[PDB]
Structures are given as structure tokens and as C-alpha cells.
């Protein structure tokens, strides 16, 4: 998310076991890196290998 | 003719005058933008009671 240029990073690591779909359970997240940049972000792109 | 190299070289000799002595000048620039304050320095902490 982005609140007036204050960008935050939320992450979570947990093992699952499925094939195609996502698990329909409940899991919280943990903030890792705070980046107070102060810019406006309108687009994004997912990096693949 | 009328074509001189603009990047002239300095002169640093210990036997010359004071004007040819090298000085390391550091210029610190400070500006304000919409980004929040990230620099610290007055953050002084004391012993806990």
C-alpha cells in the first residue's frame, strides 16, 4: 500500500501443500522493511525468471 | 590558433607559496521536500530509572 508516499513492506513465510489454487485459511503478516520515500506510485509489475 | 585545452592542471609544490597549497573543501547541501525527516543526531538517550 502507499499512504502519502510512506511505502511499507509486509511479508509472511509459511509452508503449504496444494497444487493450483490458494489455501482458504487464515494467516497474518509481519512488516519487514519500512521505506519512507515520499513518491507517488500508480503502476507496478511482477518480476519473473 | 585560438584553441586551448580548457581543463588546465593545478600546481602543488611544498616550496611554493600559500596559494598553491591543496585544500580539501567539503560543501554540505541541505534542502526540504515532501519526504519526512530521516536524518537524526539530536536523539540523545540517558540512563533508565
Curated annotation (Swiss-Prot), chain A:
Effect of residue 28 to V: In strain: 20A.EU1
List of glycosylated residues: 40
Outcome following mutation: residue 21 to G: In strain: Beta/B.1.351
Role of this protein: Attaches the virion to the cell membrane by interacting with host receptor, initiating the infection. The major receptor is host ACE2. When S2/S2' has been cleaved, binding to the receptor triggers direct fusion at the cell membrane. When S2/S2' has not been cleaved, binding to the receptor results in internalization of the virus by endocytosis using host TFRC and GRM2 and leading to fusion of the virion membrane with the host endosomal membrane. Alternatively, may use NRP1/NRP2 and integrin as entry receptors.
Subunit structure: Binds to host ACE2. RBD also interacts with the N-linked glycan on 'Asn-90' of ACE2. Cleavage of S generates a polybasic C-terminal sequence on S1 that binds to host Neuropilin-1 (NRP1) and Neuropilin-2 (NRP2) receptors. Interacts with host integrin alpha-5/beta-1 (ITGA5:ITGB1) and with ACE2 in complex with integrin alpha-5/beta-1 (ITGA5:ITGB1). May interact via cytoplasmic c-terminus with M protein. May interact (via N-terminus) with host bilirubin and biliverdin, thereby preventing antibody binding to the SARS-CoV-2 spike NTD via an allosteric mechanism.
Protein name: Spike protein S1
Full protein segment contained here: 195 to 243 of 1273
Amino acid at each position: 500500500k502507499n499512504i502519502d508516499g510512506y511505502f511499507k513492506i509486509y511479508s509472511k513465510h509459511t509452508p503449504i501443500n496444494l497444487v493450483r489454487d490458494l489455501p482458504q485459511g487464515f494467516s497474518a503478516l509481519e512488516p519487514l522493511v519500512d521505506l519512507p520515500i515520499g513518491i507517488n506510485i500508480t503502476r507496478f509489475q511482477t518480476l519473473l525468471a | 590558433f585560438n584553441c586551448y585545452f580548457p581543463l588546465q592542471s593545478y600546481g602543488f609544490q611544498p616550496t611554493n607559496g600559500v596559494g598553491y597549497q591543496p585544500y580539501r573543501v567539503v560543501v554540505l547541501s541541505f534542502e526540504l521536500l515532501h519526504a519526512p525527516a530521516t536524518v537524526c543526531g539530536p536523539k540523545k538517550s540517558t540512563n533508565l530509572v
